[PDB]
Design a protein around this ligand. Sequence first.
Ligand code: NA
Ligand code: NA
Length: 98
Amino acid sequence: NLYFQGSLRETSEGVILSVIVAPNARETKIVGIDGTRGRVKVNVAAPPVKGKANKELMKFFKKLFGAEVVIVRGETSREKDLLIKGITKKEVIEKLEL
Ligand code: NA
Ligand code: NA
């Protein structure tokens, strides 16, 4: 039921996945799509302090995609853009739709 196409774009370097983080969660997980922002809603099991939400977010998606993931926008924001290097949009969508 979730459509990720409005939260992704494929660039020269890989795929930029646009997310909005909800911290203080009991489990890091994808919960839905913010259609007004074009972002994947991700609960993150970390407080919003010490870059701890960034660390958990990148661990989660590196494991999911099997590729390196860096934060390219929003290091100190809830609205973060994640560059997944060396991957196609088709691959990213397949992993998100699991
Ligand atoms: Na590009
Ligand atoms: Na994962």
